[PDB]
Amino acid sequence: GASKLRAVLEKLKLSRDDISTAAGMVKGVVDHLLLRLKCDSAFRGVGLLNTGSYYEHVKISAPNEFDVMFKLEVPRIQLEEYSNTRAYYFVKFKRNPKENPLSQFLEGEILSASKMLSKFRKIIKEEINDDTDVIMKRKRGGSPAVTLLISEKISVDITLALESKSSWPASTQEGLRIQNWLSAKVRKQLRLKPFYLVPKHAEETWRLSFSHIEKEILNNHGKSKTCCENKEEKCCRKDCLKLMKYLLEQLKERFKDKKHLDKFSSYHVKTAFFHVCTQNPQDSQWDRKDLGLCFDNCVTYFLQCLRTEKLENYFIPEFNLFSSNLIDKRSKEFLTKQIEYERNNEFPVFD
Numbered sequence: 389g390a391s392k393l394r395a396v397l398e399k400l401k402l403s404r405d406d407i408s409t410a411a412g413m414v415k416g417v418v419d420h421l422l423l424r425l426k427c428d429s430a431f432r433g434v435g436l437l438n439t440g441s442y443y444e445h446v447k448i449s450a451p452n453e454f455d456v457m458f459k460l461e462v463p464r465i466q467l468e469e470y471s472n473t474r475a476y477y478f479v480k481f482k483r484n485p486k487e488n489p490l491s492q493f494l495e496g497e498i499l500s501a502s503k504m505l506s507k508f509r510k511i512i513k514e515e516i517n518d519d520t521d522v523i524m525k526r527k528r529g530g531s532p533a534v535t536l537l538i539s540e541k542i543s544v545d546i547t548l549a550l551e552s553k554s555s556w557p558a559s560t561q562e563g564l565r566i567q568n569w570l571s572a573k574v575r576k577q578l579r580l581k582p583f584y585l586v587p588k589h590a591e592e593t594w595r596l597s598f599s600h601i602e603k604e605i606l607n608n609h610g611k612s613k614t615c616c617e618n619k620e621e622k623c624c625r626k627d628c629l630k631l632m633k634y635l636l637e638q639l640k641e642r643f644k645d646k647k648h649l650d651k652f653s654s655y656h657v658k659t660a661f662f663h664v665c666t667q668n669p670q671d672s673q674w675d676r677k678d679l680g681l682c683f684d685n686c687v688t689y690f691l692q693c694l695r696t697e698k699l700e701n702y703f704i705p706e707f708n709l710f711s712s713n714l715i716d717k718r719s720k721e722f723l724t725k726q727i728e729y730e731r732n733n734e735f736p737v738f739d
């Protein structure tokens with residue numbers, strides 16, 4: 389049935405909702421950094437993505453790991469697609485006052501991410517010590533750009549994002565195919581919202597970031613406008629996504645000593661999930677009574693994605709998250725066997 393799945397969801401819920409001093413420490417540090425950053429010539433317009441977002445948790449199993457985004461608005465941005473990759477871009481400028489705030493990171497016409505991250509980090513690294521023990525790490529880098537450690541238990545990833553309030557880039561034109569589930573008029577409202585760019589390479593390239601659209605969908609996710617508001621209309625969409633996320637996290641934990649699962653992340657799980665939401669648009673296909681079957685649909689579909697090596701980005705249709713140049717055949721084959729073993733054994737990572 390669903391009894392074991394429900395107990396896992398309850399355990400995860402109680403440790404999320406449990407009273408904790410962690411959010412208070414995170415806010416104190418974040419507000420510290422933002423007052424310092426706003427005084428610099430380059431970052432005077434920096435601010436938190438969401439107010440009330442001192443507590444975004446990418447890892448559903450680790451309530452002490454926090455994800456925060458700092459945004460900077462770039463008016464009249466010029467995007468140049470990098471190397472037909474559809475999702476990666478150079479950032480240039482229209483330069484109305486050619487001494488725009490980010491002029492100091494220009495290299496020719498192209499905005500240097502690594503230079504901008506350099507000053508961002510250095511400014512945070514000096515402000516860190518001038519209350520609590522805050523330590524940072526220069527490891528990996530990219531996005532998350534800056535990782536802080538509050539006390540011993542609590543970690544905070546800080547990602548710097550550029551914000552543009554112009555129309556989404558053309559690679560997204562045929563994406564976000566929610567018309568038969570959330571409706572065409574909601575797709576239009578969503579695509580009027582700004583988009584974000586975060587640093588990453590496949591050089592000085594940036595990629596589109598849609599976490600804010602994901603959050604909007606998840607908070608208003610039914611075909612019915614009253615889905616999950618009360619009574620006879622309680623669905624299991626959010627629970628299926630939580631269980632998918634926890635499955636991958638537990639598997640990456642179990643096999644961290646091997647390297648094969650290193651490239652997989654919640655992006656792959658979230659993307660496959662929203663594809664199943666498109667496949668199954670009716671709220672009656674997500675009945676709370678059917679949690680077991682619905683989670684199994686999600687698992688089946690994800691496994692189908694691994695075997696065919698095809699997982700189309702939910703926002704950029706021509707971008708295959710599972711292309712062999714991104715994740716090789718042997719790694720997808722390894723995750724396939726591990727998930728099939730979980731499924732055929734009433735999921736032992738949920739013990």
Ligand SMILES: O=C(NCc1ccc2ncccc2c1)c1cc(Br)ccc1O
Binds near residue numbers: 599707
């Ligand atoms: O698809 C997304 N963003 C674009 C993108 C492009 C290439 C990538 N390559 C590797 C890793 C992550 C990648 C993300 C997205 C989807 C959801 Br649901 C929530 C937030 C998102 O940002």
Ligand SMILES: [Zn+2]
Binds near residue numbers: 610616621623624625
């Ligand atoms: Zn619902």
